[PDB]
Ligand binder design. Structure first.
Ligand SMILES: CC1(C)S[C@@H]2[C@H](N)C(=O)N2[C@H]1C(=O)O
Length: 354
């Protein structure tokens, strides 16, 4: 998988990403444009203006992230609004559709916690998956898997903070709220899960709906959110946390979950069952993500035309004890690629600002 090392100012960071992933970003934009057009009757000109409005929000509220977005645009030779689109894709898509009309686990264990997910989506995006190592002086070094062009997704940092992301569809949109991928980046720049929690909350409200898990070797929490609800998931009596694509927590009376997939319930029940017979070993933990019960709608999801629109596109396993993330591209039953991410002393020097 394309691996880009980004360092320096926010703009320089964005620029390296944009330059080195130029052709991949073009594919990301193409795919996003197709997806977006499927959700709306609006003309492209109107869509451009909405994106200009969203860009102005990011510029005002998170100038550091906007500067990076500007760098990505410059390096990829694309319009800033196109990159803004990539970084607000879910929110943008949700909003347009309203106008018109993943399996994750954390296990606390004696020889170190284990945390992981499968990311399930349209297969077209798998070829657009890249990884970035981002060094910013005085902040944790981040290593994360993302679709080319997007500044926050799934990964971990030199401080041991590991993040996971699940689609969730509670109703509501706040265009001035924090986009999900910005919140992911905020979590990835934090030195602990507690700080991550604090800094996400600091934003004063989410733009839309998703689920985010943040953990290290000691503690972990999940967040189920809408623009009007932030509910915290904690470890159960077994030191476990499981999440799929539906609300497990009680939200306010006004909250409304929109068309979650039936298999989201099946997969959660399945993973909890699997973790019951789980012996604690890293080998067995890795095998959980290859489960094919209820195929093609399984934990290891398969694309099957006329049944399931997506597949598991990657799996990540955080070995908290060793601060290593094992990544398997494609379906864990037969991965396209497998590699281990780890921080070296240079990554650590940047984090210390030494
Ligand atoms: C296309 C997807 C793989 S993406 C969404 C969620 N991750 C899930 O499961 N789905 C599938 C769906 O919406 O059919």
């Amino acid at each position: 998988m394309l691996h880009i090392l980004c360092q320096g100012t926010p703009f320089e960071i964005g620029y390296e990403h944009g330059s080195a992933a130029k052709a991949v970003i073009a594919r990301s934009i193409d795919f996003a444009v197709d997806l977006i057009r499927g959700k709306t009757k609006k003309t492209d000109e109107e869509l451009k203006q909405v994106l200009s409005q969203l860009g102005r929000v990011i510029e005002e509220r998170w100038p550091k992230y906007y500067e990076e977005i500007r760098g990505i645009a410059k390096g990829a030779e694309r319009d800033v609004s196109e990159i803004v689109m990539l970084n607000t894709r879910t929110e943008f898509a949700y909003g347009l559709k309203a106008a018109r009309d993943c399996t994750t686990a954390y296990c606390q264990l004696p020889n170190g916690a284990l945390q992981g997910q499968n990311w399930d989506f349209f297969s077209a995006t798998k070829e657009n998956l890249i990884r970035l190592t981002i060094r910013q002086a005085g902040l944790p070094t981040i290593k994360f898997i993302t679709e080319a062009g997007i500044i926050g997704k799934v990964g971990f940092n030199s401080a041991g903070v590991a993040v996971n992301y699940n689609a969730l569809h509670l109703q509501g949109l706040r265009p001035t709220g924090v986009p999900s991928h910005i919140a992911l980046r905020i979590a990835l720049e934090s030195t602990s899960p507690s700080q991550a929690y604090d800094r996400i909350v600091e934003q004063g409200g989410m733009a839309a709906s998703a689920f985010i898990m943040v953990g290290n070797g000691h503690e972990a929490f999940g967040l189920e959110f809408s623009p009007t609800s932030i509910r915290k998931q904690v470890l159960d009596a077994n030191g476990r946390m499981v999440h799929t694509n539906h609300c497990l927590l009680q939200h306010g009376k006004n909250e409304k979950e929109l068309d979650p997939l039936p298999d989201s319930w099946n997969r959660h029940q399945r993973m909890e069952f699997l973790l019951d017979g789980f012996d604690g070993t890293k080998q067995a933990f890795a095998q959980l993500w290859a489960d094919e019960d209820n195929y093609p709608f399984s934990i290891c999801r398969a694309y099957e035309e006329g049944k399931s629109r997506g597949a598991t596109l990657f799996n990540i396993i955080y070995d908290h004890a060793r601060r290593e993330a094992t990544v398997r591209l494609g379906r864990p039953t037969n991965p396209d690629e497998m590699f281990v991410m780890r921080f070296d002393e240079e990554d650590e020097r940047s984090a210390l600002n030494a």
